C-alpha cells in the first residue's frame, strides 16, 4: 500500500522543510512517492510532476 492519498505540486521552501523522503517503485506501492515532513509537523505528499521537485531529483546523484 502507498502512503499518499493526495499529491500537491506546490513549491515548499527550504525554511519549512524538516525532511524529504524519496520512496521508489515497489515495496507495496507501484508509483514513486516523495514525502515532505514540514517544520510545523504536517506531512505533505508532493507530485513527482512538480518542476522544483524534478530539479531536486536531477541533482540528487
Amino acid at each position, epitope marked *: 500500500r502507498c502512503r499518499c492519498v493526495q499529491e500537491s505540486s506546490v513549491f515548499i521552501p*527550504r*525554511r519549512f522543510i*524538516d525532511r*524529504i523522503q524519496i520512496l521508489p517503485r515497489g515495496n507495496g506501492c507501484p508509483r514513486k512517492e516523495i*514525502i515532505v*515532513w514540514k517544520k510545523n509537523k504536517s506531512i505533505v505528499c508532493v507530485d513527482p510532476q512538480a518542476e522544483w521537485i524534478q530539479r531536486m531529483m536531477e*541533482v540528487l546523484r
Partner: antibody
Amino acid sequence: QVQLVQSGAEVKKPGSSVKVSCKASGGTFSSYAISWVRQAPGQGLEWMGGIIPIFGTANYAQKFQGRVTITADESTSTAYMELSSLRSEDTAVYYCAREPDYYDSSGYYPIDAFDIWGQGTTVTVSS
Amino acid sequence: QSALTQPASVSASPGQSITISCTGTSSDVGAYDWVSWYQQHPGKAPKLLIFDVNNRPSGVSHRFSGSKSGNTASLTISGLQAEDEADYYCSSYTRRDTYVFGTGTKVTVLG
C-alpha cells in the same frame, strides 16, 4: 579543494557600487543555499542575504533591502552580491557561505548553518 | 542590528572548561534547533563548530559541545588551549526568515 573561491580586493569611492563573485570549486551549488555575510573591521558577523541557486529564490536582511542584489548562475556555480550606495560603514570583509544538507536512507535534511565559507573579499570605501 | 546577546569576553587558564551563552528570543533561538556556532581566528574566515544546537561536523574536536534551553544556547570548550584563542559567534535562523548572529565572544587563554 571543496571550497568557495571569491573575487579579489576592491577599492571603491563613496556612492559607487560593488559586485563580488563567489565560484564553487571542487563541487556544485546543487540543492544548497548560498548566503552573503559581512564583517566591518574589528566588528561582528552580519548576515546580508541569501539565494537558493536551483530555484533562484532570494531573501535579504531588512537593513540591506534595496542596496543589495544577490544573483546566481547554477550552470557555472557562481554567485554574485551587488551592493550599491557605498559609505564608510560598508568598508568590510564580505564572505559567501554554503548552507548544506544531510542525507541518509531516511531522507533529505536541510541544515541551517554555514559549513563552507569563502576566503573573504575586502571592500574599502575611500571616504 | 537586532543581534543575539553574547558576553563580550570569556577567559580561563589552560586546561580549563569554558561556557559561552547566546540569548535571543522566541522568534529565533527559542523557536527551533536551527542554532549554530562559529570560530574565527584573527585575519581568517569563520569556521563552523556546531550546527543544530549540538551536532559536530567532521574535523571538529569532541572538546566543543553545544546545548539549548529556552531562548538561550550555549557553547562549551573543554581543555582550553592556545589554539582556542579566537572569536566565537552563535547564529540562529528566524521566524522572520533571516539569519541573525550573536554580538561575538573573544576567548582568551590566561597565563
